[PDB]
Amino acid sequence: MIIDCHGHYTVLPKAHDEWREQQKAAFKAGQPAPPYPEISDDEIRETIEANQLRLIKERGADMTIFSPRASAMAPHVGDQSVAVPWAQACNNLIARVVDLFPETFAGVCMLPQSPEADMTSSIAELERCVNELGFIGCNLNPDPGGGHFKHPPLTDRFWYPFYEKMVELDVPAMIHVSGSCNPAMHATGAYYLAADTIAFMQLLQGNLFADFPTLRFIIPHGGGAVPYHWGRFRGLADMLKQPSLDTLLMNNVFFDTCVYHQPGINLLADVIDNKNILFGSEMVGAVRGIDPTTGHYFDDTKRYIDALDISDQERHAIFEGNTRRVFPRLDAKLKARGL
Amino acid sequence: MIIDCHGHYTVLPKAHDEWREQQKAAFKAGQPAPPYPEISDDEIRETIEANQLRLIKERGADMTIFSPRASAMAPHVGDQSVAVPWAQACNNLIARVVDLFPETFAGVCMLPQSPEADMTSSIAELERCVNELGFIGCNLNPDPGGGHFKHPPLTDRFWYPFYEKMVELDVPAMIHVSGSCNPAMHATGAYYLAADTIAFMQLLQGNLFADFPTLRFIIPHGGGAVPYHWGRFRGLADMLKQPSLDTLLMNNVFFDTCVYHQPGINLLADVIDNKNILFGSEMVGAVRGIDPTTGHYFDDTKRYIDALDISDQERHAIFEGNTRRVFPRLDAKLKARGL
Numbered sequence: 127m128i129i130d131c132h133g134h135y136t137v138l139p140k141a142h143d144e145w146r147e148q149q150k151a152a153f154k155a156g157q158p159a160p161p162y163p164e165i166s167d168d169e170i171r172e173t174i175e176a177n178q179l180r181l182i183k184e185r186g187a188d189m190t191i192f193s194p195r196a197s198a199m200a201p202h203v204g205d206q207s208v209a210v211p212w213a214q215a216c217n218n219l220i221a222r223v224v225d226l227f228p229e230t231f232a233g234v235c236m237l238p239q240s241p242e243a244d245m246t247s248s249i250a251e252l253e254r255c256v257n258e259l260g261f262i263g264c265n266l267n268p269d270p271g272g273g274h275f276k277h278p279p280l281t282d283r284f285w286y287p288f289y290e291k292m293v294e295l296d297v298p299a300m301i302h303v304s305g306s307c308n309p310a311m312h313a314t315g316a317y318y319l320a321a322d323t324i325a326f327m328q329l330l331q332g333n334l335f336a337d338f339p340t341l342r343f344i345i346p347h348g349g350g351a352v353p354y355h356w357g358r359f360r361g362l363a364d365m366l367k368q369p370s371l372d373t374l375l376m377n378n379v380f381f382d383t384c385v386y387h388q389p390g391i392n393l394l395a396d397v398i399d400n401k402n403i404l405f406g407s408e409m410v411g412a413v414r415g416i417d418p419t420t421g422h423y424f425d426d427t428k429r430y431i432d433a434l435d436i437s438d439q440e441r442h443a444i445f446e447g448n449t450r451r452v453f454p455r456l457d458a459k460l461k462a463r464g465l
Numbered sequence: 466m467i468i469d470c471h472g473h474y475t476v477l478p479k480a481h482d483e484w485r486e487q488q489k490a491a492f493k494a495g496q497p498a499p500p501y502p503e504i505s506d507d508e509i510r511e512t513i514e515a516n517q518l519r520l521i522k523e524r525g526a527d528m529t530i531f532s533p534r535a536s537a538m539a540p541h542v543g544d545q546s547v548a549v550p551w552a553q554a555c556n557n558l559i560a561r562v563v564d565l566f567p568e569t570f571a572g573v574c575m576l577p578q579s580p581e582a583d584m585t586s587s588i589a590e591l592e593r594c595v596n597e598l599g600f601i602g603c604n605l606n607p608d609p610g611g612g613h614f615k616h617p618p619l620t621d622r623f624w625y626p627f628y629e630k631m632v633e634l635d636v637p638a639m640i641h642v643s644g645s646c647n648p649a650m651h652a653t654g655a656y657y658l659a660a661d662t663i664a665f666m667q668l669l670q671g672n673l674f675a676d677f678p679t680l681r682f683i684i685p686h687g688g689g690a691v692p693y694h695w696g697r698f699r700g701l702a703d704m705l706k707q708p709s710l711d712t713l714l715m716n717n718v719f720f721d722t723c724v725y726h727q728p729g730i731n732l733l734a735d736v737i738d739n740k741n742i743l744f745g746s747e748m749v750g751a752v753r754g755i756d757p758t759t760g761h762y763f764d765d766t767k768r769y770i771d772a773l774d775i776s777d778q779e780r781h782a783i784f785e786g787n788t789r790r791v792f793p794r795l796d797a798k799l800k801a802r803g804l
C-alpha cells in the first residue's frame with residue numbers, strides 16, 4: 127500500500143471560496159459574515175473526482191492524507207472571530223470528503239491559529255476533529271503572523287498546553303505555514319521552505335522531546351534545506367554542545383518526499399534514515415505542470431522512490447509503514463479493515 | 466589556482482569586539498563612540514597565521530576572498546550612526562589583512578546597512594573600499610532588521626541605485642544576512658539558509674537582470690535550499706508563467722560550495738551547471754569541528770570537490786575559472802601578476 131502523507135483540498139466548490147471572500151469583506155467592514163452556503167455531495171464529489179481521485183488512480187496510490195488548502199488557511203487579517211468559523215468550515219469539508227470517499231482519504235485538520243490568540247481554540251478544534259470527525263492529525267502553523275516569524279519557537283512553553291492534547295490523543299503534527307502577507311517572501315516557493323528549515327533548527331537549539339518523549343513532528347517538503355545541508359546540521363550539534371541528531375530529533379522528527387526531482391529525492395534517501403522518510407507528493411498544489419525535462423509530472427514523486435535502488439523493506443516503509451507508525455489512529459483503522 | 470570565494474575575519478583582536486560592545490553600550494543612553502583602539506600588525510598577523518593561513522596551507526588553497534565577520538556585522542539597533550563607523554572599522558581590518566598577506570587574501574566589504582536607511586551610505590563605503598582600498602566585491606544584506614524580512618525584495622526599485630554602482634565599479638555582491646534578532650530563528654543554521662532561499666525566489670518572481678544584465682549575485686551555502694529543490698523551482702517558473710531559470714537567472718546568479726557533506730556537494734555539482742558553482746568553504750566559521758563520520762573537517766569542502774568525477778576543465782572552473790569571471794577586478798590583479 128502507498129499512503130500519500132501530504133495533501134490539501136485545493137480545487138474546491140465555488141461557493142466555498144465565494145463565502146470566504148464575503149467573510150473576509152464583512153469582517154473588514156464591521157459586519158457579521160453571511161450564512162455559509164449549502165454544498166452538495168455531488169459538488170464535493172465533482173471537485174475530488176476530477177482532480178485528486180484521478181491522479182491517485184493514474185499514479186498508483188491507495189490513500190492520501192488530506193487537510194484543508196494550505197494557502198487559504200491565511201491566519202492573518204484578522205482575528206479569532208474569522209479563524210475559528212473558517213477553520214471549522216474547512217475541516218467540515220475535509221470530513222465530508224472522507225465521508226464520500228473513506229477508503230482513500232484520511233483527515234488532517236488545520237487549526238484556528240491567529241497572532242493575537244493562544245492555542246485554546248486550536249486545542250478545541252483538534253479535539254472536535256479527532257474525537258468527533260475521526261481525524262488522525264493536525265497542521266501546526268509555527269508563524270500564524272505569516273512571514274516575519276514574530277511568534278515563539280516551537281520549543282517555547284507557549285506551545286506546551288497544545289502539545290499535551292497531541293500526546294494524549296496520540297496525533298502527530300505537520301509543521302505547516304500558510305499564505306504570506308510579506309511582498310518579499312513568496313509562500314509556496316520560499317516561505318514554506320524557510321519555515322521548515324527554521325523549525326528544524328529551533329528543535330536543534332532545544333530539548334522539546336525531553337518534555338514530550340512521544341511527540342512526533344513532520345517537517346514537509348523533504349525537510350526544507352535540512353537533508354541537503356545535513357552535514358551542516360550535524361556539525362552545529364557539536365558547535366552548540368547538543369546531543370547528536372539521531373537521538374535528539376530523528377525519533378520524533380520525520381521528513382516527507384515532496385521534493386520535485388530525482389536528484390533531490392536521491393539525496394533525501396541517501397542522507398536521512400529510511401524510518402524518517404514518509405511518502406508525500408502534495409499533488410494539485412504548488413507545482414501542477416509537467417517536467418519538460420522528463421515527460422512526467424513534477425509532483426509525481428512516487429516515480430522518484432520507484433526509481434530508487436532500494437530494498438523492498440525500504441519501499442514498504444516509505445510508502446506505507448513509516449506513516450502508519452507516526453499516525454497511530456490510521457494504523458488502528460487499517461488493522462480494523464484487515465489491512 | 467584554488468581561490469576560496471567565501472571567508473570572514475572571525476578571530477579578531479580583543480579590543481575590536483570589545484569596542485563593539487562599548488559602541489553598543491554607549492548608544493544605550495545618548496553617547497558618542499568610545500576611543501577606537503590601536504591594533505598591531507603582529508597581533509593581526511598572528512591570528513591570521515594561527516588560523517586562516519595555517520588551514521589554507523594544509524587544505525592546499527592559494528587564495529581566500531575575505532569579508533568582515535558576518536555575525537557581528539548585524540546592525541540591529543540602531544541606525545546609521547552605528548552602521549557607518551562599524552562598517553568602516555570592520556573593512557579597514559580586512560584591508561590591513563590584505564596589506565599584510567596580499568597574494569593570499571582579496572577584500573570584499575560589508576555595507577553600512579540599517580533598517581531605516583536607503584543605500585546612500587552603502588554606495589559610499591563600496592566606492593571607498595573598491596576605489597581607495599582596492600576591494601573586489603561587497604556583501605549585500607537583504608534584511609538588516611535582523612530576523613523578520615521586513616525589507617523590500619531584491620527586485621524592488623529601492624535597490625536600483627546600488628546595483629548601478631555595483632555595475633559601474635565592476636564588483637559583484639554576495640547575498641548575506643547577518644546575526645538574528647528573532648528568538649524563533651538561529652542565525653547560521655536557519656537565518657543564513659532561509660534568506661538564501663527567499664532571495665532566489667524573489668528574483669524568480671521578477672526580471673531584474675533584464676534591467677541590469679551585467680549584475681551578478683552570489684547566493685552562499687550552496688544556494689541555501691535551492692539546488693535541493695531545483696525541480697520545485699523549475700516547476701514554479703511555469704506556475705509563475707516566467708522565463709526558464711537558465712535564462713531568467715543563471716547567467717547572473719552563482720552558488721558557492723559551502724555545503725558541508727559529500728552528498729550535498731554531490732547534488733550541487735549534479736543539478737547546477739558547472740559555470741554557476743564557485744569554490745568556497747567558509748572555514749573557521751559556523752562549523753569549526755571535525756566530521757565523526759568521515760575523519761576530516763566539515764568545512765574542508767575542497768576534499769569534496771576532489772572526490773567528484775568531473776573533468777579538469779570542470780574542476781578548473783570551480784576552483785579558479787568561475788570566480789575570476791565573477792570578480793573581474795581580481796582577474797585583472799591576477800593577470801597583472803602573470804598568472
Ligand SMILES: [Zn+2]
Pocket residue numbers: 134196346408411
Ligand atoms: Zn503543503
Ligand SMILES: [Zn+2]
Pocket residue numbers: 471535641685747
Ligand atoms: Zn558567510
